[PDB]
Amino acid sequence: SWQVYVDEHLMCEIEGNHLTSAAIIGQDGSVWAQSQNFPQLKPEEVAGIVGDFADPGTLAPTGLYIGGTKYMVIQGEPGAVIRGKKGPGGATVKKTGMALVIGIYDEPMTPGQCNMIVERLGDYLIDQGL
Numbered sequence: 001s002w003q004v005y006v007d008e009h010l011m012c013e014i015e016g017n018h019l020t021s022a023a024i025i026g027q028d029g030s031v032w033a034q035s036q037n038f039p040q041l042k043p044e045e046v047a048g049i050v051g052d053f054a055d056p057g058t059l060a061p062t063g064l065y066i067g068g069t070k071y072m073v074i075q076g077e078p079g080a081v082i083r084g085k086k087g088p089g090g091a092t093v094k095k096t097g098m099a100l101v102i103g104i105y106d107e108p109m110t111p112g113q114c115n116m117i118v119e120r121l122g123d124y125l126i127d128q129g130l
Contacts, residue, residue: 081093
């Protein structure tokens with residue numbers, strides 16, 4: 001399903017560790033699939049995300065909110081990737097046609113490892129029209 005895409009391609013372990021939680025979410029707000037411990041994702045939050053891709057940097061004041069949790073905005077890519085820093089851990093959000101790929105990492109996992117996994121899947125879904 002969309003679960004296979006979350007279980008195999010996002011929550012798969014690189015070296016030792018893996019992401020804390022991950023999800024593929026319609027730009028509408030509709031979960032396509034999530035991992036066991038991905039937070040319910042307030043509607044106010046999904047908006048803030050979607051409209052930061054349309055007009056880059058819109059989110060910067062309030063910052064990336066995912067399931068109540070505040071993440072400071074790191075360098076993203078303009079209209080493609082949004083990145084979030086919360087102490088050692090963080091989050092990456094990669095935009096598709098229809099959807100968002102979201103990964104959330106905690107140390108000892110790196111931003112790099114999170115970026116790899118989230119953006120790679122993203123670019124696949126884009127290739128496929130999603």
